Design a protein around this ligand. Structure first.
Ligand SMILES: Nc1ncnc2c1ncn2[C@@H]1O[C@H](COP(=O)(O)OP(=O)(O)O)[C@@H](O)[C@H]1O
Ligand SMILES: Nc1ncnc2c1ncn2[C@@H]1O[C@H](COP(=O)(O)OP(=O)(O)O)[C@@H](O)[C@H]1O
Lengths: 145, 146
């Protein structure tokens, strides 16, 4: 059954990514939490003015913040975001299997799908445990490839 | 089925929760929102299950449930979690003998991350395990290594 595993290891992000949810880095912690409920997501991708990736913000970053009791309404998200270097990203041609393992090796719920531009790492989707769970329902229902 | 991907599908459909579950992380219903937020970081989970004086399921709590609460206009941080829990009977649960992929549809269709695994007792559901999207993602990985 090794060529079957081979073939799964070649499913690509292109086909299984969700949209990106992004915020500007100069947005407040309060505003980012708001966006989190409006978009009903679990991770936000933080961008700079033009509009390259610069960090990420999970439910736990924000909860940590709101329990910290700084002036939330004034406090910009670059203060608390997880920053570049230093985020696990992927690209549309990356294999979902690899991505699944990163999500496990690194215990995070989502990766950003970036694109190498003449601006930098721009954000063009996400891939998350939900995507993985969907790919896993699709296979059990024999609906892939 | 006739094909490789069909046989793969066939085994996927036969996997039961009992073999793909994580420990339950469980709090009492008279604990504060603040304590819940702490337990949540301590145990490093995204869903706490809430039980009563008899150890019987009474609700769930997600990370966003507690985020919403901790920034409510009203002070909700000091209040008991039963004020703010998603209550029974509108919690979706599962049992050891349930098929994993039946549970994967529920996670997706109902748009939740975890289902408590429970045991029927004459007094209600006893929490005996956790099933989440992390469990699900591990099964995918295993497909590629195994
Ligand atoms: N793609 C990522 N790359 C690097 N770090 C991340 C990434 N996504 C989240 N993180 C950080 O790692 C932690 C894990 O958060 P995550 O697993 O998404 O959910 P949560 O914090 O809601 O339980 C958070 O501190 C988050 O900011
Ligand atoms: N197993 C469940 N059954 C019923 N409701 C749940 C269950 N798990 C979570 N919920 C509720 O559904 C909403 C979404 O939960 P979930 O996706 O798990 O976390 P979050 O709110 O961080 O996105 C929350 O209000 C939570 O109380």
């Amino acid at each position: 059954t090794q060529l079957l595993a081979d073939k799964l290891k070649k499913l690509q992000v292109k086909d299984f990514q969700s949209i990106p949810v992004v915020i500007h880095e100069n947005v407040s912690v309060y505003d980012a939490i708001c966006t989190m409920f409006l978009e009903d997501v679990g991770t936000l991708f933080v961008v700079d003015r033009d509009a390259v990736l610069v960090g990420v913000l999970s439910r736990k970053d924000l909860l940590r913040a709101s329990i910290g009791q700084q002036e939330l309404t004034s406090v910009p998200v670059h203060i608390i975001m997880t920053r570049m270097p230093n985020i696990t990203v992927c690209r549309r041609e990356d294999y979902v299997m690899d991505i699944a393992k990163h999500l496990i090796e690194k215990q995070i719920d989502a990766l950003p799908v970036i694109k190498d531009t003449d601006k930098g790492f721009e954000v063009i989707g996400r891939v998350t445990k939900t995507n993985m769970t969907k790919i896993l329902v699709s296979l059990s229902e024999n609906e892939i490839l």
